[PDB]
Amino acid sequence: QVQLQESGPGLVKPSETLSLTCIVSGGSISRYYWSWIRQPPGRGLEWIGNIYYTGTTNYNPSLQSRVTISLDTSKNQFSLRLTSVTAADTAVYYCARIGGVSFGERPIDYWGQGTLVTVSSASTKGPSVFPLAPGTAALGCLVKDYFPEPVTVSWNSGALTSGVHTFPAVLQSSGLYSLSSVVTVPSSSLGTQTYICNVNHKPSNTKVDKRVEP
Amino acid sequence: QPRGAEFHMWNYHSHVFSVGDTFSLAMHLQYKIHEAPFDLLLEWLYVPIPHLAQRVASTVYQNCEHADNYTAYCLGISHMEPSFGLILHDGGTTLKFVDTPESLSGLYVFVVYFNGHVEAVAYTVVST
Amino acid sequence: DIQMTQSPSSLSASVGDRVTITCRASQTISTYLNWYQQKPGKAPKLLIYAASTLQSGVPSRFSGSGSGTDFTLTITSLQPEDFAAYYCQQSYSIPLTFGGGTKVEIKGQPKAAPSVTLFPPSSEELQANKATLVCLISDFYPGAVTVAWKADSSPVKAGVETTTPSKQSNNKYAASSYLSLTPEQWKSHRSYSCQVTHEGSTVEKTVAPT
The partner residues of A1 in beta bridges, in order of sequence, read none
- For chain A, domain boundaries: 3-119, 128-212
Structural domains of chain C ordered from first start? 4-106 (2.60.40.10), 115-207 (2.60.40.10)
Pairing of strands B12-16, B117-127: parallel
Residue A156 has, within 13 A of its CA and on its CB side, a CA count of 10
Can you say how many angstroms the Cα of residue C105 is from the centroid of all Cα atoms in its chain?
Answer: 8
Distances in Å between the Cα of B124 and the Cα atoms of A107, A154, B28, B87 are 22, 48, 13, 18
Q: Which residues of B touch A33 (CB under 8 A)?
A: 28
Q: Which residues of B touch C32 (CB under 8 A)?
A: 8
Answer whether B25 sits within 8 Å of A54, measured CB to CB.
yes
Cα–Cα distance measured from residue C169 to residue C43, given in angstroms and rounded to the nearest whole number: 17
Answer whether C94 sits within 8 Å of B6, measured CB to CB.
no
Q: Judging by beta carbons within 10 Å of its beta carbon (0-12, 13-18, 19+), is residue B97 exposed, middle or buried?
A: buried
Answer whether B11 sits within 8 Å of C30, measured CB to CB.
no
Q: Which CATH superfamily groups domain A128-212?
A: Immunoglobulins (2.60.40.10)
On whether the CB atoms of residues B71 and B32 are closer than 8 A, the answer is: no
Cα–Cα distance measured from residue A56 to residue A52, given in angstroms and rounded to the nearest whole number: 6
- Give contacts of B 97-126 with A, CB under 8 A: 124
On whether the CB atoms of residues A204 and A211 are closer than 8 A, the answer is: no
Output the CA angle C117-C121-C124, nearest 5 degrees. Answer: 140
Backbone region of residue C50 per phi and psi (left: phi > 0; alpha: psi in -120 to 50; beta: other values): left
Chains adjacent to B (≥3 CB pairs closer than 8 angstroms): A, C
Tell me which residue of C47, C45, C34 sits closest to C88, measured CA to CA: C34
Pairing of strands A33-39, A91-98: antiparallel
Tell me which residue of C77, C79, C74 sits closest to C168, measured CA to CA: C79
CATH number 2.60.40.10 is the correct assignment for the domain at A3-119: yes
Chains adjacent to C (≥3 CB pairs closer than 8 angstroms): A, B
CATH number of B5-127: 2.60.40.10
The partner residues of C116 in beta bridges, in order of sequence, read C137
- Tell me phi and psi for residue A141, to 5 degrees: -125, 145
Residue C153 has, within 13 A of its CA and on its CB side, a CA count of 0
Cα–Cα distance measured from residue B114 to residue B67, given in angstroms and rounded to the nearest whole number: 12
How distant is the Cα of A135 from the closest Cα of chain C, in angstroms? 9
Answer whether A108 sits within 8 Å of C87, measured CB to CB.
no
Compute how many other C-beta atoms are within 10 angstroms of the C-beta atom of residue A142. Answer: 27
SS3 B104: helix
Please check whether residue B25 touches A, CB under 8 A: yes
Answer whether C136 sits within 8 Å of A60, measured CB to CB.
no
Task: Kindly identify which residue of chain C lies nearest to residue B8, measuring between CA atoms.
Answer: C92
- For chain B, domain boundaries: 5-127
Cα–Cα distance measured from residue B94 to residue A56, given in angstroms and rounded to the nearest whole number: 11
Chains adjacent to A (≥3 CB pairs closer than 8 angstroms): B, C
On whether the CB atoms of residues C119 and C134 are closer than 8 A, the answer is: yes
DSSP secondary structure string for all residues of chain C: ---EEEE-SEEEE-TT--EEEEEEESS--TT-EEEEEE-TTS--EEEEETTTEEPTT--TTEEEEEETTEEEEEESS--TT--SEEEEEE-SSSSP-----EEEEE--PPP-PPEEEEEPPPHHHHHTT-EEEEEEEESB-SS--EEEEEESSSEE-SSEEEE-----TT--B--EEEEEE-HHHHHH-S-EEEEEE-SSS-EEEEE---
Cα–Cα distance measured from residue A159 to residue A137, given in angstroms and rounded to the nearest whole number: 18
Query: How many H-runs (helices) and E-runs (strands) does chain A carry?
Result: 0, 19
One-letter amino acid identity for B82?
P
Cα–Cα distance measured from residue A25 to residue A5, given in angstroms and rounded to the nearest whole number: 9
Q: Of C30, C93, C94, which has the smallest distance from its Cβ to B6's Cβ?
A: C30
Backbone region of residue C87 per phi and psi (left: phi > 0; alpha: psi in -120 to 50; beta: other values): beta
Which of B14, B17, B105, B124 would you mutate first to test chain A, the one with the most A CBs within 10 A?
A: B14
Sign of CA dihedral C138, C141, C144, C150: negative
Please check whether residue A113 touches C, CB under 8 A: yes
Backbone region of residue A26 per phi and psi (left: phi > 0; alpha: psi in -120 to 50; beta: other values): left
SS3 B60: strand
Answer whether A55 sits within 8 Å of B32, measured CB to CB.
no
Name the experiment that determined this structure.
Answer: X-ray
Do domains A3-119 and A128-212 share one topology? The answer is yes
Tell me which residue of C132, C159, C133, C143 sits closest to C198, measured CA to CA: C143
Please check whether residue B30 touches A, CB under 8 A: yes
Answer whether B12 sits within 8 Å of C94, measured CB to CB.
yes
